[PDB]
């Protein structure tokens, strides 16, 4: 079993000792060697076990029963500091000192789409065709970046252009081509990459790369489970709240209730005052987790886009189609439909156009071959010119 | 909606105007600088009542710059639209994205998404209009609309109207 | 006349009101959240956004304009950013006052250890100056070493 093995009062104690950084495993090996050497002698090292954890830097934990045993184990070592920096580990901490780590995900799944940390395809989305059993590397499906004779743009490996620019192409199978030492399978590069070269979480996909990857599958983006999970993650993480926001509750006993955010504490507890026909209920403040709150957007409110192609665009709400909200823009003066997850009720725009485009305000520019004008107002997407 | 409000203005006068006609000059300066202006807080100031008998008080000399500062209090007629208000209008332009009406000095834009569906935009009609079987709204046509949202600018106000509810549309 | 024209009216300070900054106000007046310890992005100019040298905080270079106000170096006053703390910590300047406040109130019900029923307590509350008022209230409530769940009738204490 596993539950029954939890420690008791009569179990051997655990001590932690500060040591010099980077020598923890060395101290562990020295302790084991000393225990083995003195095992079977008149004065054996009266300890039971010793270990360390990578996260808990500078600490080595020994399971024993006596402080003299700890002193004897540490006697003759140079990594131990001058002072006896030893402490008694609390019995409750015994389970935590040996609990595992990095259990967020079971494994890297073959066929999943991931981003590359570094290399020539730094940041390019890649499909995990193969996961090596070692777990340190994995073979991936990528879009080649070649010039055929500062990196070239990603493009499917073209055998005809490659032969024209380099007639030394090699062939091993049908559809599997090796050019310049790189193996391209049906126009897609297949190359092993280390685990330290991949981002397996918070992956941001683009429909352009998705289409370029799924075109060979005879259907545009047939696989959408991992994409749906990424959508859920993006929707959940992008939500940020402020006092005074009108929100609705999705779960809990208070489901389908409206309220206004009164105060914000940390990023997971939000104090909300609820609104209802009963006056005595409207005078109560409730702290509610943010994971069960949805923003309420009323028609005719100034709202600013948080994230997306229309970032920093503002306008007035016109149509509320549930998840997707429609609003008339201010700069383009046209209706734009964006999800309610990307909108914040900002009563004032005050948009700054700096660090965008080539021209600033009051710039005398040439409209065309005949018309010359000056800039009166700048936008995130266009400019206004008086000729 | 029109209102009467007691407003105040801070007026700075250059020393070159320190003459016997100081008071009247301050009066015309106030009239030129207030009549017709548009402030988001108040709306539009259309006229100033008793414009020739406004008290200006005693101006204070700004230390280090010589110019005098005057505090002028006056009563003026002010118009400001409110959210959720139904007012009369006259259509000024017809466009596929919607039609623009005028409510006094304010120009209101109504999008197609706030127009009843039966009022299909007819570009072939002369002039082009948003028309139904029994309704035809074109340039110069009286319309009764409800203001839904107001946008505040530096010295301008942008309002959005709707005719999608009852007792609205053509009148 | 050495300053570029601004339409805001020019006035002079008549009162300075002191006080503390609420976390809500700190979050409100901030323009960016500081989270990355690296000062420089990749040591290739353009300091990392979200770091301690975010361009939104303000500009100190002649050829670089502030990304928040758009003004030059001579006009940008600087804009604040905020950093969220994982665990709340003491303000080093208020620890003695925090200790005094802890001595004045109950640690469970969050109420004063004395009430207006005591003539001395009412006399102390009658004073106007906040500092002397706090001093008198502390001098009285310091001796009271136990919360009362009942009137010395329930006074709101937890006992």
């Amino acid at each position: 079993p596993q539950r029954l093995l939890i420690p008791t009062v009569d179990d051997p104690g655990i001590w932690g000792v500060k040591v010099r950084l980077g020598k923890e495993k060395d101290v562990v090996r020295q302790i084991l060697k000393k225990k083995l050497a003195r095992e079977g002698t008149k004065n054996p090292l009266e300890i039971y076990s010793a270990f360390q954890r990578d996260s808990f830097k500078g600490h080595v934990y020994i399971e024993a029963r006596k402080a003299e045993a700890i002193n004897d184990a540490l006697k003759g070592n140079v990594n131990v500091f001058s002072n006896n920096s030893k402490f008694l580990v609390g019995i409750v901490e015994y389970k935590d000192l040996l609990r595992p780590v990095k259990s967020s995900d079971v494994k890297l799944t073959r066929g999943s789409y991931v981003r590359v940390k570094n290399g020539k395809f730094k940041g390019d989305l890649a499909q995990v065709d193969e996961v090596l059993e070692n777990g340190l590397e994995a073979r991936l499906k990528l879009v080649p970046r070649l010039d055929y004779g500062f990196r070239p743009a990603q493009r499917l490996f073209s055998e005809a252009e490659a032969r024209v620019h380099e007639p030394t192409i090699r062939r091993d199978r049908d559809g599997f081509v090796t050019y310049g030492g790189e193996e391209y399978y049906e126009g897609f590069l297949y190359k092993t990459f280390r685990l330290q070269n991949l981002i397996v979480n918070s992956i941001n996909p683009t429909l352009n790369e998705l289409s370029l990857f799924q075109s060979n599958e005879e259907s545009t983006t047939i696989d959408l489970s991992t994409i749906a999970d990424s959508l859920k993650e993006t929707a959940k993480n992008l939500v940020s709240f402020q006092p005074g926001d009108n929100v609705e509750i999705i779960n809990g006993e208070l489901n389908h209730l409206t309220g206004t955010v009164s105060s914000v504490n940390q990023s997971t507890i939000v104090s909300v005052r609820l609104h209802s026909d009963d006056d005595t209920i409207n005078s109560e403040t409730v702290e509610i987790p943010t994971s069960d709150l949805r923003k309420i957007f009323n028609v005719g409110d100034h709202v600013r886009v948080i994230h997306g192609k229309h970032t920093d665009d503002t306008g007035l709400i016109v149509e509320v189609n549930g998840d997707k909200v429609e609003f008339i823009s201010n700069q383009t003066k046209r209706t734009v439909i964006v999800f309610s997850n990307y909108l914040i009720k900002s009563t004032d725009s005050t948009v700054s156009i700096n660090e965008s485009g080539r021209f600033e305000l009051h710039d005398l520019v040439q409209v065309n071959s005949d018309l010359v004008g000056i800039v009166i107002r700048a936008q995130k997407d266009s400019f206004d010119v008086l000729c | 909606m029109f209102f009467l409000k007691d407003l105040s203005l801070i007026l700075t006068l250059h020393p070159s105007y320190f003459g016997p006609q100081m008071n009247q000059y301050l009066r015309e300066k106030l009239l030129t600088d207030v009549e017709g202006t548009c402030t988001g807080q108040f709306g539009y100031i259309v006229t100033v009542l008793d414009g020739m008998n406004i008290d200006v008080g005693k101006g204070r000399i700004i230390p280090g710059s010589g110019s005098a500062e005057f505090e002028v209090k006056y009563r003026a007629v002010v118009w400001k639209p409110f959210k959720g208000e139904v007012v009369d209008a006259i259509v000024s332009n017809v466009s596929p994205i919607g039609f623009f009406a005028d409510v006094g000095p304010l120009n209101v834009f109504v999008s197609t998404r706030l127009i009843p569906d039966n009022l299909v935009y007819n570009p072939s009609n002369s002039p082009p209009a948003y028309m139904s079987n029994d309704e035809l709204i074109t340039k110069g046509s009286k319309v009764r609309l409800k203001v839904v949202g107001t946008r505040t600018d530096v010295n301008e106000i942008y309002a959005i109207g709707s005719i999608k509810e009852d007792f609205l549309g053509a009148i | 006349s050495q300053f570029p024209y601004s339409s805001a009216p020019l006035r002079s300070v008549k009162e300075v009101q002191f006080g503390l900054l609420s976390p809500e106000e700190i979050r409100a007046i901030s323009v960016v959240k500081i989270e990355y310890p690296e000062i420089m992005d990749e040591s290739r100019q353009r300091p990392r956004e979200g770091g301690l040298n975010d361009p939104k905080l303000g500009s100190i270079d002649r050829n670089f304009k502030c990304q928040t106000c758009g003004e030059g170096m001579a006009e940008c006053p600087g804009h604040f950013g905020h950093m969220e703390l994982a665990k709340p910590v003491f303000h080093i300047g208020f620890i003695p006052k925090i200790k005094k406040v802890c001595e004045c109130i109950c640690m469970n019900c969050g109420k004063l250890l004395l009430d207006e029923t005591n003539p001395t307590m009412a006399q102390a509350i009658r004073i106007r100056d906040p500092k002397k008022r706090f001093n008198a209230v502390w001098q009285l409530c310091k001796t009271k070493m136990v919360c009362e769940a009942d009137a010395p009738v329930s006074r709101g204490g937890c006992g």
């Binding site: 009051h362 005398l364 000056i374 009166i376 107002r377 008086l386 | - | 339409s7």
Partner: peptide, 27 residues
């Protein structure tokens, strides 16, 4: 012959208005 005059009194187009150089006099 075009000059781009800006005035703080004028509100239209943030005070920017185009006027020919032949129709103005030096102040």
């Amino acid at each position: 012959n075009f000059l781009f005059l800006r005035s703080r009194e004028i509100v239209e187009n943030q005070g920017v208005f185009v006027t020919s150089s032949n129709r103005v006099k030096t102040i």
